[PDB]
Amino acid sequence: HWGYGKHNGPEHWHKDFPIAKGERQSPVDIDTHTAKYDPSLKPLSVSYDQATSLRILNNGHAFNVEFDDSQDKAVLKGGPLDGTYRLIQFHFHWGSLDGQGSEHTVDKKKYAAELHLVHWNTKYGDFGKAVQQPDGLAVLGIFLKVGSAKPGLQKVVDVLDSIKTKGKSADFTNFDPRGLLPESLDYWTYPGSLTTPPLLECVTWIVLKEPISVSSEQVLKFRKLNFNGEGEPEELMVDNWRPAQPLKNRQIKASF
Numbered sequence: 372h373w374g375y376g377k378h379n380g381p382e383h384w385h386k387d388f389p390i391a392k393g394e395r396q397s398p399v400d401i402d403t404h405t406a407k408y409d410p411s412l413k414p415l416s417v418s419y420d421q422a423t424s425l426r427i428l429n430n431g432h433a434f435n436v437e438f439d440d441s442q443d444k445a446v447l448k449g450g451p452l453d454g455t456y457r458l459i460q461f462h463f464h465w466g467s468l469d470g471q472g473s474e475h476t477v478d479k480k481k482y483a484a485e486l487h488l489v490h491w492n493t494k495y496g497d498f499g500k501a502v503q504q505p506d507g508l509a510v511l512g513i514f515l516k517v518g519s520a521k522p523g524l525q526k527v528v529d530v531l532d533s534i535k536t537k538g539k540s541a542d543f544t545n546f547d548p549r550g551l552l553p554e555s556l557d558y559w560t561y562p563g564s565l566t567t568p569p570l571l572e573c574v575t576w577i578v579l580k581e582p583i584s585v586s587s588e589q590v591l592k593f594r595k596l597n598f599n600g601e602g603e604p605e606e607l608m609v610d611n612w613r614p615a616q617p618l619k620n621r622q623i624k625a626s627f
């Protein structure tokens with residue numbers, strides 16, 4: 372029964388998921404004066420031209436926009452990565468107020484939200500096998516700040532009313548995730564974990580330096596979602612973010 376409240380939030384997760392206190396937990400604070408440029412990093416390649424979205428689901432924690440990952444249609448390669456990583460879903464974490472919401476922080480700065488584009492390493496055949504491997508996933512993290520509207524997010528915003536409560540889904544075909552990307556692909560990378568239970572330590576994190584801007588009306592529609600199921604008392608889906616975790620013996624590298 373994990374969640375984001377007092378009684379079931381991040382400080383409780385370690386009881387059911389002891390890896391919460393592990394050596395490679397995410398998110399982390401990115402100290403820009405400690406992260407070092409790595410000339411060994413190869414160019415990052417985001418190839419989303421043939422992406423095939425299918426559906427959007429409120430899972431009681433966030434919403435997932437799901438993709439057809441039965442073939443190499445939307446892949447992430449290059450940068451720190453060896454091989455090919457297939458896009459399976461994206462989701463966001465966000466706050467109740469514009470001053471909080473992101474999971475990663477940059478010199479302790481919190482953004483209003485954070486987008487996670489989740490990809491799995493095709494050498495392991497499926498997502499479920501990939502998450503049991505230290506290089507099984509690659510998550511592209513993108514910060515959201517409140518300013519101008521993001522045209523490419525509006526199709527997402529406008530379907531949320533149809534998936535207000537936990538367990539609801541809606542058809543969501545022909546959504547282009549390229550429209551959620553900032554101009555620059557300058558990034559930081561480090562080894563980490565899923566930021567939700569089961570908190571598996573399988574992720575190569577790639578966190579873009581340049582945030583995207585979204586409008587206050589857009590993020591306000593995120594905040595109208597519900598953690599609860601239909602017919603239950605309303606608990607707004609806000610502050611579904613885990614705070615920064617100890618860096619331990621890890622290196623954050625910069626691509627720039």
Ligand SMILES: O[n+]1ccccc1S
Nearest residue numbers: 487489510565566567
């Ligand atoms: O929050 N989250 C859920 C699933 C896979 C990755 C991540 S970051």
Ligand SMILES: [Zn+2]
Nearest residue numbers: 462464487566
């Ligand atoms: Zn996430």
